[PDB]
Amino acid sequence: AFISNYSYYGNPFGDGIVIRIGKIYPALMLGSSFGNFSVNNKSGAYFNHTLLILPSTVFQVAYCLLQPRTDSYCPGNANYVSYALINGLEDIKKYFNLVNCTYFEEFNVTADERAEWFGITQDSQGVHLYTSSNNLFLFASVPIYDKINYYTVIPRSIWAAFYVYPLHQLSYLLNFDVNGYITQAADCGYND
């Protein structure tokens, strides 16, 4: 694989994120606690149950506890550098043992070639997955009641790029057109 050190980051989840795709459809690891692997001191470990969203387009979504493998170049080994994807779940299983799983579903969404948006938020009813007009609509809900604090982009090899933006409790004015889509919006606190 040819990768960047994305696995070393545990980016604050906050309230949620939105992703601009443009096209490898991005793979994410999300959880409540983030730190180092105890053998090699590399950043990138998640503790307890971790949410894995692995596109392969259908989304493979799992909520499992990860137990890193100790073989050569695995997260439990001294010579480890980083895990990567090249089904997405089978590549993860090469680096981690997946145990104590409470959730697993596959979402057939049916995306096109055109630009795509994807989002993740969390509330009392679980983790809400949104997808795209370029408006985000809810397509799935995942029964995770453990607050997500961090997310990680899982490195991939086959170029392509995507952008991740944080969500905030902002007040917006939303302009709906004749087809019922939001075509413009005002971020009220942006400017005068």
Partner: peptide, 8 residues
Amino acid sequence: PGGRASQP
């Protein structure tokens, strides 16, 4: 509100 004791 609506949450639970954290994993720690």
